Amino acid sequence: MRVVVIGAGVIGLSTALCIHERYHSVLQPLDIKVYADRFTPLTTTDVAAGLWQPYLSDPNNPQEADWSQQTFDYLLSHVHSPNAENLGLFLISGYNLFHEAIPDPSWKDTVLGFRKLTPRELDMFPDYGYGWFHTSLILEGKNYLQWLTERLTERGVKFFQRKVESFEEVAREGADVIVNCTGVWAGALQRDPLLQPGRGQIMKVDAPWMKHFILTHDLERGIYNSPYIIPGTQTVTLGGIFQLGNWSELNNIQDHNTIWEGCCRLEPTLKNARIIGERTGFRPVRPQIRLEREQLTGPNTEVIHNYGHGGYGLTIHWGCALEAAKLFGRILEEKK
Amino acid sequence: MRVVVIGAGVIGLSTALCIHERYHSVLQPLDIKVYADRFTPLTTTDVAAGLWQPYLSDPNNPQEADWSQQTFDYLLSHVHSPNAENLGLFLISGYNLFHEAIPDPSWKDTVLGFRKLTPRELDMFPDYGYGWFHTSLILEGKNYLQWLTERLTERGVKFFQRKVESFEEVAREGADVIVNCTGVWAGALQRDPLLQPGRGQIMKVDAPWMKHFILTHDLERGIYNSPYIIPGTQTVTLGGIFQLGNWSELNNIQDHNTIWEGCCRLEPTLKNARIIGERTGFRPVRPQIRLEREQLRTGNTEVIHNYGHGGYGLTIHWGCALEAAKLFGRILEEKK
Ligand SMILES: Cc1cc2nc3c(=O)[nH]c(=O)nc-3n(C[C@H](O)[C@H](O)[C@H](O)COP(=O)(O)OP(=O)(O)OC[C@H]3O[C@@H](n4cnc5c(N)ncnc54)[C@H](O)[C@@H]3O)c2cc1C
Numbered sequence: 001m002r003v004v005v006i007g008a009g010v011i012g013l014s015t016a017l018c019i020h021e022r023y024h025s026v027l028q029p030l031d032i033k034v035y036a037d038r039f040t041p042l043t044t045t046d047v048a049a050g051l052w053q054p055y056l057s058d059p060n061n062p063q064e065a066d067w068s069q070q071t072f073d074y075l076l077s078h079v080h081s082p083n084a085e086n087l088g089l090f091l092i093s094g095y096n097l098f099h100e101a102i103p104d105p106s107w108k109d110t111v112l113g114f115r116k117l118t119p120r121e122l123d124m125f126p127d128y129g130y131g132w133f134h135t136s137l138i139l140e141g142k143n144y145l146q147w148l149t150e151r152l153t154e155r156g157v158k159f160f161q162r163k164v165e166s167f168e169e170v171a172r173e174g175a176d177v178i179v180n181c182t183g184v185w186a187g188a189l190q191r192d193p194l195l196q197p198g199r200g201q202i203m204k205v206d207a208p209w210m211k212h213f214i215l216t217h218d219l220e221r222g223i224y225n226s227p228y229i230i231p232g233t234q235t236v237t238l239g240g241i242f243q244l245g246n247w248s249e250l251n252n253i254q255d256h257n258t259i260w261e262g263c264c265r266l267e268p269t270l271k272n273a274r275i276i277g278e279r280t281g282f283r284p285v286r287p288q289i290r291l292e293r294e295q296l297t298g299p300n301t302e303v304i305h306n307y308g309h310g311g312y313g314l315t316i317h318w319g320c321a322l323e324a325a326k327l328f329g330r331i332l333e334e335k336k
Numbered sequence: 337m338r339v340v341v342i343g344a345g346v347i348g349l350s351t352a353l354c355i356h357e358r359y360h361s362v363l364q365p366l367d368i369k370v371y372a373d374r375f376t377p378l379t380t381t382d383v384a385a386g387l388w389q390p391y392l393s394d395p396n397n398p399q400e401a402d403w404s405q406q407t408f409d410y411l412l413s414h415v416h417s418p419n420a421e422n423l424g425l426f427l428i429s430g431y432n433l434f435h436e437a438i439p440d441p442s443w444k445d446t447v448l449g450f451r452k453l454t455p456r457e458l459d460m461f462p463d464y465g466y467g468w469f470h471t472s473l474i475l476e477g478k479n480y481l482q483w484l485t486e487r488l489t490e491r492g493v494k495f496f497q498r499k500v501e502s503f504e505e506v507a508r509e510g511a512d513v514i515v516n517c518t519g520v521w522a523g524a525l526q527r528d529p530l531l532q533p534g535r536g537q538i539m540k541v542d543a544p545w546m547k548h549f550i551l552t553h554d555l556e557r558g559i560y561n562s563p564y565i566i567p568g569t570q571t572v573t574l575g576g577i578f579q580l581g582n583w584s585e586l587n588n589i590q591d592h593n594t595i596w597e598g599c600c601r602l603e604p605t606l607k608n609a610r611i612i613g614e615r616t617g618f619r620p621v622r623p624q625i626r627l628e629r630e631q632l633r634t635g636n637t638e639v640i641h642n643y644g645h646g647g648y649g650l651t652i653h654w655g656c657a658l659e660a661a662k663l664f665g666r667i668l669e670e671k672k
């Protein structure tokens with residue numbers, strides 16, 4: 001059995017690992033390769049703060065809510081483990097702020113200690129009149145990707161830096177299953193008008209007195225088009241940019257200004273915080289995650305798609321990897 | 337009017353500043369001088385992490401509940417101003433862990449968003465079965481004392497490094513009011529058998545992924561004789577040593593091991609944190625704060641005592657300071 005995973009973001013690397021844990025014992029030659037054009041630290045995954053939080057509104061596929069909840073339990077189960085530091089994993093609480101009242105999120109019982117904000121809390125934020133407080137987790141993609149890499153290396157998974165041109169090129173080399181975890185670029189392998197860049201930009205800032213995340217929302221502007229402030233391990237992520245169809249992988253001054261002045265107003269102690277770096281990335285936006293089998297091609301090759309995780313790839317990755325690992329088990333039964 | 341404030345910890349500096357702000361305009365000569373044996377960073381104020389939290393049991397003097405609330409409201413009014421970083425002041429949420437259910441604390445409505453831990457939060461901590469979550473404040477003594485020093489230097493308040501041997505040595509120099517802010521050492525200037533040292537010890541470690549405080553409680557061993565973990569702006573404080581009557585200003589290896597092993601069992605990710613430093617100080621333990629006036633005979637002289645804040649001098653300093661300034665006004669009234 002020869003398996004080629006395309007993509008070394010969190011989606012491909014976690015899928016690779018999951019497929020290996022569940023089937024190395026029962027497939028005598030289980031040879032897994034990863035083809036990726038970019039590795040950490042140059043993926044979309046490395047740009048994310050890594051806060052666990054799905055979108056506010058229920059997903060078009062209800063099984064995504066389970067995949068997120070399965071990811072949360074796995075990560076929470078390891079947050080006190082000694083190797084949590086190597087994962088870039090830790091607990092964090094904070095605020096979601098709104099101008100108007102709004103229905104409670106579908107994941108209110110996935111997170112810890114969910115509640116509405118008391119009136120004295122909403123006084124610290126003049127421009128906002130309603131919101132939530134809850135405890136979640138941060139999984140910083142860069143530590144995590146490096147962790148996944150070294151786990152798959154000790155399991156025999158080999159890594160190759162190449163741009164794949166077609167599915168059929170990979171099948172020609174003799175792949176049996178192709179796992180397609182190509183993120184926002186999946187359209188180049190197979191046209192998909194439902195997949196779109198959601199361009200984001202973030203600032204990384206030294207502000208270690210900040211112990212809480214703070215996400216604000218403007219419901220007439222789209223999600224993550226309002227300031228947010230997410231403390232990481234070494235640095236504080238400042239953000240609030242979400243632009244559909246924008247493929248420019250290049251930091252933009254206007255967006256820099258939007259992030260800075262938006263966050264500084266939200267939390268004035270930021271004014272003196274030092275800017276450590278700035279980064280742009282492309283959420284793979286789709287109305288739903290594509291996570292499903294497809295049979296292509298010459299004499300036929302199995303493909304497992306797993307892309308389109310928008311702005312919640314880190315939040316939902318483990319449930320997705322588990323599901324793709326299931327789809328892989330079904331391929332093996334069909335192949336006898 | 338010549339005022340001599342003895343002591344440059346949090347109590348003496350805040351009281352000096354509080355008195356100058358309220359009376360420099362209506363006292364044409366208001367010469368305030370601070371005398372201190374030790375300044376930052378050699379005071380026990382410097383050793384404290386600075387978490388705002390009273391003892392759990394109701395204070396012997398009910399006016400201390402108000403002094404603590406006034407301090408929290410004051411600090412909370414300044415946490416979102418760019419001044420805040422200079423003070424060393426920021427918001428922080430976290431846990432108080434108990435083995436068994438116990439009564440709520442009196443101060444439960446002073447802090448933000450108080451509530452009980454849910455079962456899934458309690459599961460993160462095997463050794464404890466009950467507790468609280470809430471949002472409080474940290475005021476790190478080191479930055480706060482240097483900020484107080486700067487506000488005071490800007491106001492003509494001159495400082496002198498000297499050991500005061502007696503009250504009337506200071507009166508013989510010409511002091512009209514003496515503000516006694518000598519903390520744990522007050523018994524040397526006037527015997528007070530109710531004032532005793534509560535020796536504590538703490539480690540500072542590098543663990544910047546800890547975003548919550550965690551205080552544990554063992555009602556059999558007494559308050560703060562159980563692991564606590566308090567993230568600061570730059571390092572995390574590990575502690576849990578409260579030894580009545582011990583005057584040894586020296587780090588002890590047994591107490592090191594108790595702190596380290598207790599906090600590592602509480603939070604295993606701490607086992608790879610680098611130890612940055614280690615400090616010992618003396619909580620000025622008294623069954624209630626001595627904040628009151630006394631006429632002492634000389635030649636006589638006016639005295640305001642303000643000492644014996646135990647393990648909550650930062651929690652309560654500002655209410656005490658305002659009270660000491662009222663008492664200063666009553667002195668001005670009697671002399672017309
Ligand atoms: C600014 C910003 C902030 C975010 N914050 C969060 C957050 O806080 N929490 C959260 O959960 N999510 C967040 N996200 C979303 C998250 O980053 C993404 O959903 C996630 O990284 C997508 O994972 P992925 O592996 O599919 O794609 P990415 O990591 O891009 O990985 C794609 C991989 O596919 C490879 N590839 C593509 N095409 C080919 C090819 N033809 N041949 C070979 N290799 C190919 C790429 O080189 C790369 O290796 C954020 C995103 C952005 C942009």
Ligand SMILES: Cc1cc2nc3c(=O)[nH]c(=O)nc-3n(C[C@H](O)[C@H](O)[C@H](O)COP(=O)(O)OP(=O)(O)OC[C@H]3O[C@@H](n4cnc5c(N)ncnc54)[C@H](O)[C@@H]3O)c2cc1C
Nearest residue numbers: 343344345346347373374384386387500519536648649651
């Ligand atoms: C380990 C530990 C942790 C703590 N953590 C916290 C916490 O998290 N939150 C909290 O609220 N509280 C905490 N505390 C308690 C807090 O540190 C004390 O209550 C507070 O700092 C005492 O303030 P002070 O100004 O009275 O005395 P200290 O700062 O000592 O100041 C005393 C001053 O008086 C001077 N002085 C004394 N005698 C003379 C003299 N004869 N002549 C000249 N100068 C003299 C001393 O040199 C010094 O200048 C902690 C205490 C300890 C020990």
